[PDB]
Amino acid sequence: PKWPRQIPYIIASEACERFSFYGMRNILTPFLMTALLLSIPEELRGAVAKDVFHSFVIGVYFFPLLGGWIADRFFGKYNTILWLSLIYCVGHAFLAIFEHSVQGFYTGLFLIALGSGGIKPLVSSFMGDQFDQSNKSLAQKAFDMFYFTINFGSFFASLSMPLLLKNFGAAVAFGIPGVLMFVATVFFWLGRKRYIHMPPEPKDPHGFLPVIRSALLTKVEGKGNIGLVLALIGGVSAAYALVNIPTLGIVAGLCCAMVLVMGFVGAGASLQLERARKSHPDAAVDGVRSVLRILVLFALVTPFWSLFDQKASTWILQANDMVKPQWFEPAMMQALNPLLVMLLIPFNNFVLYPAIERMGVKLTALRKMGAGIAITGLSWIVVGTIQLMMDGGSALSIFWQILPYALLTFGEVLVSATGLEFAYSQAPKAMKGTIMSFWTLSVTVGNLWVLLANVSVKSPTVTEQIVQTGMSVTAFQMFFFAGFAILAAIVFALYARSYQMQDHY
Numbered sequence: 001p002k003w004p005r006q007i008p009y010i011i012a013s014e015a016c017e018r019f020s021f022y023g024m025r026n027i028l029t030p031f032l033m034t035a036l037l038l039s040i041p042e043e044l045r046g047a048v049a050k051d052v053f054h055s056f057v058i059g060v061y062f063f064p065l066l067g068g069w070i071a072d073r074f075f076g077k078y079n080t081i082l083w084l085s086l087i088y089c090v091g092h093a094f095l096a097i098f099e100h101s102v103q104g105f106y107t108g109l110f111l112i113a114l115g116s117g118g119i120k121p122l123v124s125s126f127m128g129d130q131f132d133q134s135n136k137s138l139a140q141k142a143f144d145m146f147y148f149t150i151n152f153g154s155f156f157a158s159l160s161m162p163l164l165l166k167n168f169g170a171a172v173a174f175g176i177p178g179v180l181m182f183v184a185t186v187f188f189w190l191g192r193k194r195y196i197h198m199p200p201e202p203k204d205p206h207g208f209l210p211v212i213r214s215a216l217l218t219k220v221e222g223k224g225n226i227g228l229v230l231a232l233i234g235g236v237s238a239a240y241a242l243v244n245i246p247t248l249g250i251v252a253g254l255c256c257a258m259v260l261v262m263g264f265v266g267a268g269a270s271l272q273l274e275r276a277r278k279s280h281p282d283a284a285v286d287g288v289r290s291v292l293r294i295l296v297l298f299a300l301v302t303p304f305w306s307l308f309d310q311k312a313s314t315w316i317l318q319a320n321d322m323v324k325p326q327w328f329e330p331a332m333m334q335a336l337n338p339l340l341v342m343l344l345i346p347f348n349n350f351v352l353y354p355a356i357e358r359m360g361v362k363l364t365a366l367r368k369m370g371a372g373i374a375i376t377g378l379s380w381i382v383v384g385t386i387q388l389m390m391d392g393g394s395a396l397s398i399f400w401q402i403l404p405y406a407l408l409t410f411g412e413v414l415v416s417a418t419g420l421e422f423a424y425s426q427a428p429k430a431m432k433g434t435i436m437s438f439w440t441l442s443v444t445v446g447n448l449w450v451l452l453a454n455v456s457v458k459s460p461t462v463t464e465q466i467v468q469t470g471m472s473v474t475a476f477q478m479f480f481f482a483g484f485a486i487l488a489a490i491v492f493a494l495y496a497r498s499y500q501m502q503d504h505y
């Protein structure tokens, strides 16, 4: 077997793109606090910074749906990646050019979310269909390299970019990733004559959505349709969220609508799924049933993303008020996660998991996902006490946030490295694209909670609850989020026992 000569041009493109993304995302929260949002009072500024960051993340893990659609329906993967990558480049440029204008900076974030998210499903799979049956032995080695560039990039970008921002300002700190991103596209363009382009996939008339549409619109004799009522309810509810945009916010409102719609339509279709058998194959309707069960699984995982994504926003804010060295910047703590990932992932699989299995435990992939959410919630118990403990008294940053990072990352390996691969085995191969699409929306919805948390916290009724606790609002939210994960981890274990009673033995 020989290495396809196109692979180096994709690994190289990925390397630069992953460096440029983590490069500007990891100094995004510091930049908002020190520079762009200075017109906001300090106490107020922390809440506005989180909104900007997490509204950005939301778009990053929402726009894969647009990207995958454009590639499959019209222009193909190569051409879609190329033009989304150029837009991605422009977005990075906007961040430098409109350094001092808020409207212009938000616009650049949008283009980055559009470019980075749009090419996220396309690039990895595009790399995949460059291997034939003879090559396939090497494909696993190629995707291994992908994994390395993610961590390599996220590690060094967390170290170098805070320093670059400190010494040179935003224009240089945001321009260097932009330069890097342009080189990323050049590498991808340099192998255009080499790439293998798979023929456009034929649309499935028995796909996930056509079955859903059948389950709602098909009328059975002498009965009503509860399912379609729920759909209309979600349509009504979404409208109630869309109208309340002035309170919620634009990105928060659009997600609330999206969640309510897909939430109520999904519920309604489940009630009436047997009606779909009239218009669709038995194997195809059964598959949708398999996916709908995975949906509930993913929904309970969303509080994990709420805690894991806040390390680049909330956790940085806390590190600002801790005891750090002269050379050290609070944003450099983010480098701990890729380091811990590359340590725990070989540790667990080789040393720890067989050691827990030696005790006798099964260690089902479903058992690990539930444990990971709890440990992630546990990590925020530690983050919460620290805030309490440092409300009066001073604790150093560099030693102390190593513990929450150790627990957070350990929960990430249990959940994030297990979820999608497990769901693939649970549903028919045809649903692989549908499963992947809801997995990325899982991250989006998780960050929606972060958005809705500090929206509800500004309401009069909630403040008095905070007043009664006699706790700092900052610390109160953390414990809320800690309990948010523990509760979901409980319900997860409750649903997981019913889940394994279903499809097979």
Ligand SMILES: CCCCCCC/C=C\CCCCCC(=O)OC[C@@H](O)CO
Binding pocket: 048, 051, 052, 053, 055, 056, 058, 059, 060, 062, 106, 107, 109, 110, 111, 113, 249, 251, 254, 255, 258
């Ligand atoms: C599900 C559909 C929603 C997708 C929206 C895509 C968003 C991508 C980038 C947005 C960046 C701009 C963020 C600014 C913002 O919302 O600020 C929040 C507010 O609290 C302060 O102005």
Ligand SMILES: CCCCCCC/C=C\CCCCCC(=O)OC[C@H](O)CO
Binding pocket: 003, 007, 008, 009, 011, 012, 015, 016, 180, 183
């Ligand atoms: C400012 C310029 C930055 C340029 C450097 C960025 C990254 C450059 C190269 C990244 C790594 C390329 C390795 C490719 C490779 O050998 O893949 C394996 C092949 O399949 C086997 O030979």
Ligand SMILES: CCCCCCC/C=C\CCCCCC(=O)OC[C@H](O)CO
Binding pocket: 070, 075, 079, 080, 083, 084
């Ligand atoms: C039909 C596109 C509508 C989508 C609306 C929102 C997205 C905004 C910009 C998407 C950019 C599309 C990139 C792909 C592309 O332009 O391919 C062009 C072909 O290569 C032309 O031969």
Ligand SMILES: CCCCCCC/C=C\CCCCCC(=O)OC[C@H](O)CO
Binding pocket: 259, 262, 263, 266, 267, 270, 292, 293, 295, 296, 299
């Ligand atoms: C009180 C709910 C708070 C909001 C949570 C997020 C969204 C909620 C539900 C969306 C995803 C679940 C819908 C799919 C579904 O009903 O599957 C059911 C299966 O048929 C199980 O038998």
Ligand SMILES: CCCCCCC/C=C\CCCCCC(=O)OC[C@H](O)CO
Binding pocket: 208, 209, 212, 258, 261, 262, 263, 265, 266, 433, 434, 437, 438
């Ligand atoms: C949650 C299941 C029912 C959703 C009905 C459609 C609602 C309209 C917009 C909500 C956003 C989610 C779109 C669904 C989706 O991810 O489709 C996946 C495709 O099958 C992927 O190839």
